[PDB]
Structure formats: C-alpha cells, structure tokens
Nucleic acid binder design. Structure first.
Ligand SMILES: Nc1ccn([C@@H]2O[C@H](COP(=O)(O)OP(=O)(O)OP(=O)(O)O)[C@@H](O)[C@H]2O)c(=O)n1
Length: 367
RNA sequence: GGCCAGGUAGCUCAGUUGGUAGAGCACUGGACUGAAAAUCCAGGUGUCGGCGGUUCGAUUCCGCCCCUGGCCAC
C-alpha cells in the first residue's frame, strides 16, 4: 500500500540498507527501513491511518515509526548528511556497498533494485568494501562493524578497505570514538553465532587492545575460546532447550586474565546480565577452589551438592577441564534426573527436616 | 530497542543459606453509645506483577511477557 500512497502524494519511497541486504541474502526481517524523497512523516501518518494503527512521529529527526502486525516500519526523509536530498546522497553517507543499496516500492518501477556503488557485485563476491577512503575516519565505530559483518556473512575485506581500516586503528581513532557506540557494537557482536570469527578479526586487527584497557592476546585464552566453542556446540546440541546467551561466556574467557577492577568496570559499561556478573565474580575467585573440590570428589552426592546450586554458565566453564568434562556430563544427562512414587513419599513425610531426610534418601539412592 | 533498579495490604515501606510472612493509618463484627467517635478484645489486613519450566515444594532459580522510573543507543 506504500507505493499507492506514495503515488497519491507524488513521492518516491525506497527500501534501504541492511534490510535490502538481508532480502538479497534471503533472510526475512520484521524491521523495514524506508527512505522517502519528500516528507516521510506524512507518509507514515497516512499509512498508519489507513491501517488504523498508532504512529510515532519524530519531526526533528525527520523520521517516523509505525507497527503493523509483526512488521516494524521506519520512514526516514532523505538526507545528504548525518535543499532536498536525492536518494543517492542518502545512500552514499552509509558504511559499506552491501548496505548502500535500495529497492523501489514505487508502483511504476516496483521491484527494482537500485545499486549505485556496485554493492550487488561485492555481495556476490563476498566483499566488505567502503564507499570512500575517509569512511573509517568519519565513523571509527565502523571499524568494528565491518569485522562484525565479515564475521557474520563470512565475507572478506577488500585490500583498499583493509588498508584503510589498519590505518584508522593505527591513528588511535578507536580511542577518540564515543565509548557507548563501541560498547554497543561489541554487544551486537557477542549476539552473533559466528561471533568467534569476529573475535578472530578483533585479534587480527588488534582493536580490543584499543577498546579494552590492559587486554592482551595469548594462546591459552584462544584455545579456551575454541574449547568453549566445542562445549557450546554440544550443549546447544543435546541440551538446546536449556540454552542461554553463549557470547557472554566468550567475553568472560577474554577478560579472565584481566584485573578484577577493569573486568567489573568493563562489565559495568557493557550492561551485562546479572548471571554474567555472578559467573565472573565466581570465576575469578571461588572457581579454583571449586575445581580442587571436584578433584577430591568420590561419591556422586558430593558432586551433586557442589554442582546443583550453580548456574549453567558455571558448569559450561567447568567443562573446559578435560578431567571434569565427563563428570559434568554425567551430572547433566543422568545424575540430577530422578523421582519417587506416592506411597513412599507419603511414608517419608510421616519443616526443613523433611528436606534433610529427602537429601539423605537421594544420597542413599546415588551411592 | 539494551540495561539497572523498583512491583509486598486501600496507601506509604523492610524481608536470601527454598521450609508454613510483617509495621504506621483505613475493613468487617461485637463489647461501649440516645446516635457517633475514641478506645479494648481482637482478628480480613496478601494466589508478595502475569504466564510456563526446574524442584517433593518457588516471593527466591531460570525463561517469556505486563507496568513504572531512570541511564542510554535512538
Ligand atoms: N556509521 C554508520 C552506521 C550505519 N550506517 C548505515 O545505517 C544503517 C544502520 O542500520 P543497521 O541496523 O545498523 O544496519 P543493518 O544492516 O540493518 O544491521 P542489522 O540488520 O544487524 O541491524 C546501516 O545499514 C548502514 O548502512 C552508516 O552508513 N554509517
């Protein structure tokens, strides 16, 4: 209905950005970004009015948001910078060629993909390429983004883009960039399933050294990351109903050798979940003694007592040890699964003493 | 949209190793009164946001959502 309203208003609207990319990548999303020549606000208001839904105008930004079903629609007036601006000017201010394309929703040309910079080719050639040499200097945050994209889509940086990125990092522009944008970029990164490769790119171009203070790369951490990769694979395979956020575990592995102050401060800046902070504070101190206790474990009930109160993250961190692996697994798919019939429990019940007795019965069954 | 709190009676507020819930003023009833209030005995003072899951058992552990306030990314 967008093309119709755009025709009535004598306007030109286009689908724009990553939304197009995901479309060309076959990935359907519920968030659509529009660029409108002419007023986007009135377009959004009219579209929201016809479908009879609420509208959220932003006059100063020149954009408007409206939700139809599960579809989240954003209309944005064309602008040459972050006189009426052409679509091309609105596209050229963006980051990479694959994010620089557009698809026309106007009824006459409808279905047409508009690519000025050859983003279609780079998408076809699996290439992450900047629109202009000054791109990374304009927005240093993009330094992460590229890598992140190169992580997700398994693309490669062009020689140009790569040299420009290295030059950008060497200038220390990563420190000059706003802390919030970078931290948010990392938060976006860890949510990726391919985020490990993104970390490989972070190590390769050494951006984490700039972002995180006191952080350095070694082999033990990397091997820990790949071991954690395997553990995450298995856990998300068999136990997949129990899944949690995995990237935070990698993030914990990275900052493990860091001081507790810088770690707590970083997790503070990252707005990490509570279980993440707890798992970290537990890892830095009590984890060692916990492992030493698991080594002294003989009966299965001791393993129970030492494990069951812990979160899943702590267990997945305990699976990093070769000797404790099969033990953790044994606790997972077997040990903690059991029950009791009616009459027996009725005899068990005849306060906290009921719980103690039940514990005695469990340790009676195990061993 | 991300996160941090906050969600406890009508209102204003505390509560951790999961194990049988609390204060200050309104609420009912009776004793009291010509009526009423005060006051005494007392006792409602609550599925401690909503829905699932784990657990013998969840205000607590976790997950998905509702609401309010604040940091932001917008
Ligand atoms: N410094 C920046 C940041 C963003 N952009 C452009 O603005 C858009 C911001 O939308 P975003 O959601 O960040 O990009 P997506 O490809 O949609 O990524 P995702 O779908 O993962 O959100 C991007 O497409 C990018 O082309 C840019 O030109 N310069």
């Amino acid at each position: 209905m967008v093309g119709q309203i755009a025709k009535e208003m004598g306007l030109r609207a286009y689908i724009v950005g990553g939304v197009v990319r995901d479309i060309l990548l076959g990935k359907e999303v519920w968030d659509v970004d529009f660029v409108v020549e002419g007023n986007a606000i009135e377009l959004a208001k009219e579209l929201a009015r016809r479908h009879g839904v609420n509208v959220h105008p932003f006059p100063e930004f020149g954009t408007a948001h409206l939700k139809i079903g599960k579809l989240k629609l954003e209309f944005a007036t064309a602008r040459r910078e972050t006189e009426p601006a052409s679509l091309k000017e609105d596209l050229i201010r963006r980051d990479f060629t694959i994010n620089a394309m557009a698809i026309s929703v106007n009824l006459e040309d409808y279905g047409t993909l508009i690519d000025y910079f050859g983003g279609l080719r780079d998408l076809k050639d699996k290439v992450i390429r900047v629109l202009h040499p000054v791109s990374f200097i304009e927005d240093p945050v993009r330094i992460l983004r590229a890598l992140r994209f190169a992580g997700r889509l398994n693309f490669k940086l062009s020689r140009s883009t790569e040299k420009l990125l290295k030059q950008a990092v060497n200038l220390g522009l990563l420190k000059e960039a706003p802390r919030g944008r970078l931290i948010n970029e990392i938060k976006l990164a860890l949510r990726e399933d391919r985020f490990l490769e993104i970390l490989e790119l972070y190590r390769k171009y050494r951006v984490l050294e700039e972002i995180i203070e006191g952080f350095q790369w070694n082999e033990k951490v990397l091997q820990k990351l790949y071991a954690l990769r395997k553990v995450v694979d298995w856990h998300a395979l068999e136990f997949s109903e129990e899944r949690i956020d995995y990237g935070w575990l990698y993030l914990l592995i990275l900052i493990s050798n860091l001081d507790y102050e810088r770690g707590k401060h970083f997790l503070e800046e990252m707005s990490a979940p509570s279980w993440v902070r707890e798992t970290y504070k537990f890892m830095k101190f009590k984890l060692g003694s916990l492992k030493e206790e698991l080594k002294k474990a003989k009966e299965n009930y001791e393993v129970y007592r030492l494990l069951k109160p812990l979160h899943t993250s702590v267990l997945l961190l305990l699976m990093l040890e070769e000797e404790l692996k099969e033990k953790i697994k044994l606790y997972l798919e077997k040990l903690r699964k059991v029950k009791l019939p009616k009459e027996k429990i009725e005899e068990l019940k005849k306060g906290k003493e009921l719980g103690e007795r039940i514990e005695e019965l469990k340790r009676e069954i195990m061993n």
